[PDB]
Amino acid sequence: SKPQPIAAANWKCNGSQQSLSELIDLFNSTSINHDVQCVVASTFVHLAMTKERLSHPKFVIAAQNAIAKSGAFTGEVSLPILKDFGVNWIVLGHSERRAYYGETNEIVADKVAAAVASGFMVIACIGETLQERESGRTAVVVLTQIAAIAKKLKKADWAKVVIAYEPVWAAGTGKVATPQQAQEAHALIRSWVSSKIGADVAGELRILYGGSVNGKNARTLYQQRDVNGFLVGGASLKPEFVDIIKATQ
Amino acid sequence: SKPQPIAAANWKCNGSQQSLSELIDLFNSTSINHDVQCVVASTFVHLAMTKERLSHPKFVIAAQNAIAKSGAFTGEVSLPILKDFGVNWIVLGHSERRAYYGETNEIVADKVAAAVASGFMVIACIGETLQERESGRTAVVVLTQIAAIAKKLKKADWAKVVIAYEPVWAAGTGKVATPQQAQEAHALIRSWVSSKIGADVAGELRILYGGSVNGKNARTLYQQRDVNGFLVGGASLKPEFVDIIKATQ
Numbered sequence: 001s002k003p004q005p006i007a008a009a010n011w012k013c014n015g016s017q018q019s020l021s022e023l024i025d026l027f028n029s030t031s032i033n034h035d036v037q038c039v040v041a042s043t044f045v046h047l048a049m050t051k052e053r054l055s056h057p058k059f060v061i062a063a064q065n066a067i068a069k070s071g072a073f074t075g076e077v078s079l080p081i082l083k084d085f086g087v088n089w090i091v092l093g094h095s096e097r098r099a100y101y102g103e104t105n106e107i108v109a110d111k112v113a114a115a116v117a118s119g120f121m122v123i124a125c126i127g128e129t130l131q132e133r134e135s136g137r138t139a140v141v142v143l144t145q146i147a148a149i150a151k152k153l154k155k156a157d158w159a160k161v162v163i164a165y166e167p168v169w170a171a172g173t174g175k176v177a178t179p180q181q182a183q184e185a186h187a188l189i190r191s192w193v194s195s196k197i198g199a200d201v202a203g204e205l206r207i208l209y210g211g212s213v214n215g216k217n218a219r220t221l222y223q224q225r226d227v228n229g230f231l232v233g234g235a236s237l238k239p240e241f242v243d244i245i246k247a248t249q
Numbered sequence: 250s251k252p253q254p255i256a257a258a259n260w261k262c263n264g265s266q267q268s269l270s271e272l273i274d275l276f277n278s279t280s281i282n283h284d285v286q287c288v289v290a291s292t293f294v295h296l297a298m299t300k301e302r303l304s305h306p307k308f309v310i311a312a313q314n315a316i317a318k319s320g321a322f323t324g325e326v327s328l329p330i331l332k333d334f335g336v337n338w339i340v341l342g343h344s345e346r347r348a349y350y351g352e353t354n355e356i357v358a359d360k361v362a363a364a365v366a367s368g369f370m371v372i373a374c375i376g377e378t379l380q381e382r383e384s385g386r387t388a389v390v391v392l393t394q395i396a397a398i399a400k401k402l403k404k405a406d407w408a409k410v411v412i413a414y415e416p417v418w419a420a421g422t423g424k425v426a427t428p429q430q431a432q433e434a435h436a437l438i439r440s441w442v443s444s445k446i447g448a449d450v451a452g453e454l455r456i457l458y459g460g461s462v463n464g465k466n467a468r469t470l471y472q473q474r475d476v477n478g479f480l481v482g483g484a485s486l487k488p489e490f491v492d493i494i495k496a497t498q
Contacts (some may be wrong), residue, residue, distance in 0.1 A: 013322040016333045043326050045334050048297030067323025072482065073262040074343040075314030075350065076291050084265045094323040101324065102351055212478050233321070 003204045005222070005248035006229035007038035007161060008123060009236030010064065010091060011046075014129070019054065019237075020046055020188045024241055036229070037247045039123070041091050043078050051086055062089035062123070065097060068114035072126045079118040084132050092117050093125040093149075105148035113152035116160045123231060124149055125210060126189075127166030130173050142185070143192055150196060158201045163189055164231040166210035177211050181222050187227035215243030252453045254497035255411060255478035256290035257372060258485030259313065259459075264295055269326070272486065273302045280492045281307050283498045285478070288372070290340050293326050302337060311338035314346060326402070328367045339364050340480070342374040343392075344415045354397040362401035365409050372480060373398055373457065375438070376415030379393035381421045390442050391434065399446060407450045413480040414439060415459040425459045428469045428476075435475035447453060464492030471496050 011020070020042065032038070040063040042050050047182045050061050064083050070078040082090065092115060093108035103111075107126070115122045126145035128138045146163065153161065165185050177205045194202035206228040209221055214235045221227055229248050235241055260269070281287070290311040291299045299310050310492065312331050319327040322376050331339065341364060342357035352360075357373070366372045375388045375394040396410065402410070419426040436458045443451035458470055459480035470476055478497055484490055 005432065010323060010398060011324045013316065013319050013327050013330070015330065044293030045296055045330055046325055067262065070263050070346060071261070074259060074345040076262045077294050078262050081262070081264065081292060081294055091323065094321040096321055102255065142477060164377065 002225070003206050003228055005036045006123075006206050006208055007036055007241075007245040007248055008062070008091070008164075008208065008229070008231045009235055009241055010041050010231055011043065011096070011237060012064070012096070012233065013043060013239055015043065015046055017046075017049060020049065023237065023239075023241075024050060024053045026242065027059060028053075030056065030242050030245070032058050032245060034057070036245060036248045038245060039089050041089070045242065047085060047087060060089050061087055062086055062091060064094070066090060066092075066115065067085070068111065070244050079115055079120065083118060084122075088119065089123070090124065091123045093145075095125060095127055095129075095166045098125075102247060105145050109148040109152045111164070112149050112166055112186070113157075116153060116157045119160075121160050121162065123162045123164050123208065124201075125164045125166055125231070126170045127185075130169035130175065133169040136227045138185070139188060142188060146189060146192060147196070155201065157211075158193075158197060159206065162206045162208060164208040164210040164233075165189060170211055179217075179224055182209050182211060182221060183224035183226055184196055186224065190226050205240075212246075215240040215247070218244040218247035222227060250366055251423065251474070252455055252477055254285045254489075255372075255455050255457055256285055256476070256494040256497055257290060257311070257340070257480045258423075258490055259290050259296075259343070259456065259480055259482050260292065260486055261313070261345070261482060263486055266295075266298060268467060268486075269295055269298065270302060272488075273299065276308060277302075277304050277455065277489055279494070281305075281324060281494060285494060285497045287362040296334060296336060310336050310369075311334055311340055312336050313340050313343070314373060315339055315360065315364065317360060319455035324472065326418070328369065329362055331432060332367055337368065338370045338372070340372045340409040340413070342398075344376055344420070345418045354394050354446060357394070358397040361398050361414065365402065365406045365472050368409075370409050370411065371451065372411045372413050372457065374402075374413045374415055374418045374480070376434075376459065378412075379418040379424065382418040383459070387434065388437060391438065396445070399442075404450060405449060407442075407446060411455045411457060413457040414438060415480070417459055428466075428473050431458050431460065431470055432475055434470075434491065435473070435477075439475050453492040462493055464496075467496035471498075
């Protein structure tokens with residue numbers, strides 16, 4: 001059987017206290033009858049209200065970024081501060097932070113290693129841009145990204161790691177990933193993990209699809225062998241997210 | 250007389266729920282007999298707790314950073330999110346963000362302009378490094394930083410602007426800034442604001458000192474004509490911060 005699935009909401013830099021409370025109320029009233037870990041990654045500001053008001057036992061809260069240590073880093077939030085706040089999940093290496101906020105493969109890898117060392121479950125993001133895919137460089141780009149992460153982990157650390165594959169090449173470019181394309185990318189990742197880390201690790205690793213997913217297409221995506229759930233963007237701010245959760249049966 | 254002073258606590262990337270709760274209780278218990286605006290700039294994570302627990306009527310709460318607009322910017326917090334969260338003050342362009350997190354003069358200027366346009370009070374940070382000061386380039390660097398900010402503002406906008414001068418050249422470099430050196434920098438800034446914006450704006454602009462401020466040296470720094478308060482770092486995490494507040498007369 002496939003490993004336990006994950007349905008993660010990446011709210012990105014969005015939400016009002018009122019609009020997000022509506023979503024949390026919906027989640028609290030949702031019947032989830034199978035084993036799936038649901039994750040709500042809100043902005044730092046909204047963690048207080050999500051921690052307080054989420055009552056559904058299958059949900060955990062998550063941060064969308066951090067730096068490794070507390071200190072003289074005005075504007076940033078550290079892993080120790082998040083752990084003290086009760087936050088045990090984190091999304092790291094998102095394509096938007098790789099593109100906009102200076103996160104090289106090695107900076108992402110050090111953040112993931114610090115987060116694992118600090119007791120987080122880590123959703124580590126990798127994926128290639130349209131420039132990189134159109135020039136036939138999916139494999140070099142994606143394997144280089146996960147290899148950089150792997151160099152700062154030991155085998156036992158992968159129990160705390162989740163990989164999200166972002167098809168950045170299909171992000172607002174009008175291009176679209178088929179489920180077969182997503183499976184092929186996930187299969188590439190799992191093959192590397194099996195060979196470099198171990199077949200035992202690869203067998204239980206969650207690889208989440210981080211492309212455009214909605215209530216309509218989620219079930220078809222999840223039926224691919226190497227898809228273990230989702231890191232959802234825009235649909236995670238919509239009632240639609242419930243359908244993405246139930247699609248991981 | 251000098252304009253209303255500001256005593257701003259930049260907690261930076263620091264704090265536990267317990268440690269900040271105890272610090273807030275001390276601030277709540279503090280009697281402040283003179284007219285001064287106190288500011289607590291916490292991490293994004295701690296804004297809810299600070300909103301709940303900080304009750305001293307001479308204190309307001311500030312963020313330490315933001316981006317201009319909500320949207321697909323994973324890990325970041327936007328001005329509309331902060332305004333929905335009841336946060337109306339913000340520190341922008343801190344030397345640590347100019348150093349580590351890609352904030353050029355122009356990026357700082359655009360963030361300040363968006364914050365003013367969104368109704369924030371803005372503590373906008375400028376200041377030169379050791380290499381810049383020793384190269385004779387204090388004036389060129391600091392006035393170029395504030396010029397980039399100023400070119401996006403109309404005269405009326407300066408009612409919402411506070412300048413913080415950071416002597417980065419004395420921040421863990423083995424150098425110490427004297428009250429006379431602080432005065433010289435503040436006078437330089439005010440003179441430029443007078444010449445380029447207006448004598449009326451310059452007369453009432455708060456220019457805060459953002460170097461090493463503690464309970465000892467605060468009083469001698471505030472005695473200078475053109476020092477209007479402090480953006481306090483390490484000492485703002487300590488009881489010592491109340492003495493810095495009381496040194497603003």
